[model samples]
Target: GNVDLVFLFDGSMSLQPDEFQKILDFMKDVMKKLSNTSYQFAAVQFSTSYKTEFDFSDYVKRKDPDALLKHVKHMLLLTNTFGAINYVATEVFREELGARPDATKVLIIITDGEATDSGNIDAAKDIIRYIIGIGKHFQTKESQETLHKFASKPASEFVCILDTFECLKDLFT
Candidate 1:
């Protein structure tokens, strides 16, 4: 499919080290399935702060999978998910990253629980959004509700909930 996909990873204190590694495996599985050259990819890992591991332009220019994966690692800390999402909407998805006006824009946000703050709603409106809520933390009433709000329309299609870390592979597969 034609797309500009940005995968947002939560690196907050709540996500354990082993779970983070599983998240990486989830990413790898998806990429392996697609093995798509047409679609561009960018990655952002966030905690108290957000790091743009690799912008779409980096992949468009280099086309190196190993180099891209090398940039994705844990940065565990306080969760500032709202801030990270806002930043990516305003800064990371601009012309600098080779974001074209006509391409399909997709944002995949993976988190263990609710955001630390209220995220920007308007920023994500024009894009397709998918939220992967990992672990049992999202089982609570409030967190479960918030998960739906974070995803795009047809919540069934865009929202993925996993009770265990290992379940991520089956979700993507």
Candidate 2:
């Protein structure tokens, strides 16, 4: 039951306020689903660079899941998707950052665009990854293929591509 759930968000301005609001609700929903289980959470916002909005230890001190996220600040930067992936594996999930050695690592990437830099394909190979790509860009074949290669196995289950404006309340049902 021990899990380290990291919600990796695209902080670029391209994803409007409304788009981000629904995603925030989605993240909150997942947290509720696993509320009965033992878990720690981390939030990472990425665009031109990546920012660790909160780490496991911070969550521990706050102990307020519902109030954890404020209005997200759109970075107004380009999507550096790959760089953020590498950061998660090398930085955010580090033991010192409150990542438990015994806990299962689950990194969920929520982004709407492609990467500005070529990222390492094997960056987070060992971590279970779930990618939520919103908007029309990811619907393209070229983008879809790349997303599949970057995401974890069982593409159908791990990779999500959809329109953000559509109510995502049914996302995980």
Candidate 3:
């Protein structure tokens, strides 16, 4: 696949330490599968804040997997989902990754519950379309318009609706 993959993981404190570890496993599998492909990857963990944990281009070039995994193991998973995602959409995506020329940007957001702030989704959608220039379809079924449109579409051609965190592995595999 031709993609610049950005995986944004949920780091909300609502998930217990052990539960967070499960989330870590979920993401690790996701990246591992994606790494086996041609896609370039970047993993960003977000609580109330966002941190760029690893860039696949960097590690893939050097043929290192443990360095990326180390960041996953040690990073202090925190809270604040809305603020963290917006931080990524604005500063990280637009500045750090968006600067890449002719890249097919794909953002994978992994979160269990709804955003803490209602306005966060709206801001995020705007960033996805206006800032990222991918149009409004980026949210999948998270918004009413996308859901309503998908309701009438053929099942075979339907866009993927990733519900459970474990479902993420299917996206790459």
Candidate 4:
């Protein structure tokens, strides 16, 4: 009823397979309270352009829970974590899951390390389609646009950044 959320977990090799599974398990536990009767949940995973993982929409048609779990797990197999963020932003965010206006479409990026992909003006054309990015922070220097804008801090980050249990709690409420 509120938003169409796509849990974009960091299924990159940077995380141990078991650690990522624990994250997913945590997601499932929280998601149990999410009513399929009201809201929609999709899983979008990423690693790199070449290693970009599955889109939940593809499997949604199957409606197989176990299969869904397996697919989510499979994304972690991608060992390339560096180029994955931009790949997710440019390819995945730009094309397939274009930002939604009516729905609170969210891409929950869960990463344990700093981003390596530097998607700049060269890739702007494709990525411009999705306007909801890097505009959620405050700094002394403002060139009007920066890649870091998407990962805003405190109150206004375009994409919600959560690395700890406390921020995760804020996410649900």
Query: Evaluated with TM-score, which candidate comes out highest?
Result: 1
lDDT of 3 at 165: 33
Steric collisions counted per model: 0, 0, 3, 8
Candidate 4 wrong stretches, greater than 4 Å = 50-65, 73-101, 120-150, 153-164, 168-173
lDDT of 3 by residue, 9-102 (tens): 6766665577666656655666666665656666678766677777645545543445565756434455555565566555554434433445
Ten-residue stretch with the least lDDT total in model 3: 127-136
Count of clashing pairs, candidate 4? 8
lDDT by residue for model 1 over 51-128, one digit each (tens)? Answer: 988888887876666668786658768888778777778877787778876777878788975677774677868878
Please write out the lDDT profile of model 4 over residues 25-99, one tens digit for every residue: 655554565545333455555554343334435433544444556644445445333354345545554235433
Off by over 4 Å in 1: 137-143, 162-173
Rank candidates, lDDT, best first.
2, 1, 3, 4
lDDT of each candidate versus the true structure? 0.73, 0.75, 0.50, 0.44
Write the residue-wise lDDT of candidate 2 on 106-165 in tens digits: 888887746777857586888988778876577654566656755787665567664432
Q: Arrange candidates by TM-score, highest first: which order?
A: 1, 2, 3, 4
Return the TM-score for each candidate structure: 0.83, 0.82, 0.60, 0.54
Higher-TM-score candidate of 2 and 3? 2
- C-alpha displacement of 57 in model 2, angstroms? 1.3
